Design a protein that fits this description.
The chain has about 120 residues and is an alpha+beta fold. It has one domain: Phox-like domain (PX Domain), CATH 3.30.1520. The protein is about 40% helix and about 20% strand. A three-stranded antiparallel sheet has the order 1-2-3.
Length: about 120
């Protein structure tokens, strides 16, 4: 009965890339299954910055630390950062008012490294 947004962070690659699959039934999306979505950290910052000021009635989860995300040096670091982005996606998906915002869809569906908000 509920709208759902399920992200599975599958890996990472200045401006690191976060790789994830996405499953949703939200009518704001073009389709339902997305595989190997690639988003740069700066695109995440753009989405957070929009949501933080656009949805002030909700708590928008703070992004994983840029310092630790940009500072990956061990495979252990890589796993910890992967888990951090997984936790971020999980908390985002748990707010039904946030996932209804079409900027979430535009972020996920736009070309790698191109997302800035459509809405002002």
């Amino acid at each position: 009965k509920k709208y759902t947004l399920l992200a599975k962070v599958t890996g990472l690659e200045e401006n690191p890339t976060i790789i994830f699959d996405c499953s949703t039934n939200l009518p704001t999306f073009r389709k339902q299954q997305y595989k190997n979505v690639k988003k740069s950290y700066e695109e995440f910052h753009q989405l957070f910055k929009y949501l933080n000021v656009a949805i002030q009635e909700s708590f928008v989860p703070t992004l994983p630390s840029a310092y630790t995300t940009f500072g990956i040096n061990s495979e252990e670091d890589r796993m910890k950062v992967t888990r951090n982005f997984q936790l971020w996606f999980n908390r985002l998906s748990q707010d039904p008012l946030i996932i209804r915002n079409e900027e979430v869809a535009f972020f996920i569906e736009s070309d790698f490294n191109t997302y800035t908000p459509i809405n002002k």
